[PDB]
């Protein structure tokens, strides 16, 4: 009769950077979604594949929660089929994604006067990330023909930057916290279902 640790993810103290998003596997508990789609606190609750009304009355095999923080002008890229820097180098969603993406502003908990450089993100890479691929390498990206072999300079950059979060930025540059709940349907007796 245990309850799913939904509060441990949404009310968490700190979120990981977008480049290395956190991952939480939820199972063996009863899921009560009435709190989610009736909270009036999330600024985005898009669902692809199902609807918030029917989502509660449908059994799920497994569920994964990927939480991160991205700037305001990059929340429109977390969707199946979209492209961009975040959609090819940081977080790539599959084309047959069946799940939901919650998002809410956090301009009062992830900001500080002078700049907050604790949230990193990848900018340069060789190829595009596969669906649900994680990369935490910090090697020097090579853009030219000459091999830099680990020294920075011309044609050799650092593939990790960070946003300058400040409390005086526009809504496009404000740090929004995003949580993607994916439902990987497999062959299982549906251990987790709603009332």
């Amino acid at each position, epitope marked *: 009769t245990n309850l799913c640790p939904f509060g441990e993810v949404f009310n968490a103290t700190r979120f990981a950077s977008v480049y290395a998003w956190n991952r939480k596997r939820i199972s063996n508990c009863v899921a009560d979604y009435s709190v989610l*789609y009736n*909270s*009036a*606190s*999330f*600024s*985005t*609750f*898009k*669902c692809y594949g199902v*609807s918030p009304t029917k989502l509660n009355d449908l059994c799920f095999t497994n569920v994964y929660a990927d939480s991160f923080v991205i700037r*305001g*002008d990059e*929340v*429109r*890229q977390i*969707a199946p089929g979209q492209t*961009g820097k975040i959609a090819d180098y940081n977080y790539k969603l599959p084309d047959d994604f069946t799940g939901c993406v919650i*998002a*809410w*502003n956090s301009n009062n908990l992830d900001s500080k006067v002078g700049g907050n450089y604790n949230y990193l993100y990848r900018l340069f890479r060789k190829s595009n990330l596969k669906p649900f691929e994680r990369d935490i390498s910090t090697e020097i990206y090579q853009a030219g023909s000459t091999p830099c072999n680990g020294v920075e300079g011309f044609n050799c950059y650092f593939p990790l930057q960070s946003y300058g979060f400040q409390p005086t930025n*526009g*809504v*496009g*540059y404000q740090p*929004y916290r995003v949580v993607v709940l994916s439902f990987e349907l497999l062959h299982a007796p549906a251990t987790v279902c709603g009332p």
Partner: antibody
Framework: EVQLVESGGGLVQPGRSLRLSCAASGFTFDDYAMHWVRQAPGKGLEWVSGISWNRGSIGYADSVKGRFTISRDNAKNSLYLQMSSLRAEDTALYYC?????????????????????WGQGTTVTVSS | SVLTQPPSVSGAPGQRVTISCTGSSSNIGAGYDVHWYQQLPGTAPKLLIY???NRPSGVPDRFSGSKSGTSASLAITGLQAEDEADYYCQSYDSSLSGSYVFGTGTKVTVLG
């Protein structure tokens, strides 16, 4: 079939308050987002405010932020707008539009499909 | 912000005309699309072009649209007697809690 009719229009001396309503039928009003669009007599369009599927995302224009209050009730499939402290510029024609996505937001929206269905219009004249 | 448009464009039947909607680094500089609405005299505005490249049902094949850089352009080839109206461009803005912005408006009239 999709039609929106707005009532609650008339003449009110500046300073008073008004309530502009907007009903809906022929579609799922519970999902789509709603917006208010005003147009001055013989001028261009202008945005007023917008709600999206819940009271979580609510946006207002940079000139009517502290005056207009938008609301909605999914039971009766209707939205409301409570205007107050009117000035000599609020006289216009108002339309209650809807978004083209099922669960699009208003504060950081994915601007696609535009606004398909528009209302007939309701006049709001403010003459002292 | 606001989107700039030419105040008036005209022409003859069977001629190509174009309207330009210029934005900024926030309106069109980001990955925000731009839609085109057409308003007839005395009627409610109608959705003419959505997504800056697609076209809803009902709109004929004459109306086309294309964006580039930070500016979009609508094109009407082969004007008729039914295309004298107002045209507006719309896009989102992300600045100090940005809001939906509209264009100035272009009055297209055929020189009959």
């Amino acid at each position: 079939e999709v039609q929106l009719v707005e009532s609650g229009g008339g003449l009110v001396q500046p300073g008073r308050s008004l309530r502009l309503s907007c009903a809906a039928s022929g579609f799922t009003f519970d999902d789509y987002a709603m917006h208010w669009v005003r147009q001055a007599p013989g001028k261009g369009l202008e945005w007023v405010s917008g709600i999206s599927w819940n009271r979580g995302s609510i946006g207002y224009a940079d000139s009517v932020k502290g005056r207009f209050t938008i609301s909605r009730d999914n039971a009766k499939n209707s939205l409301y707008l409570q205007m107050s402290s009117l000035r000599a510029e609020d006289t216009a024609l108002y339309y209650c539009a809807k978004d083209g996505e099922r669960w699009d937001s208003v504060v950081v929206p994915s601007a696609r499909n535009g606004m398909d269905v528009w209302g007939q219009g309701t006049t709001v004249t403010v003459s002292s | 912000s606001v989107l700039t448009q030419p105040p008036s464009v005209s022409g003859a039947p069977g001629q190509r005309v174009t309207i330009s909607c210029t934005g900024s680094s926030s309106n069109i500089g980001a990955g925000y699309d731009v839609h085109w609405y057409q308003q007839l005299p005395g009627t409610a505005p109608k959705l003419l072009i959505y997504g800056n490249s697609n076209r809803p049902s009902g709109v004929p094949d004459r109306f086309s649209g294309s964006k580039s850089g930070t500016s979009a352009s609508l094109a009407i080839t082969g004007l008729q007697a039914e295309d004298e109206a107002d045209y507006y461009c719309q896009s989102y803005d992300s600045s100090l809690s940005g809001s939906y912005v509209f264009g100035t408006g272009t009055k297209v009239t055929v020189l009959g």
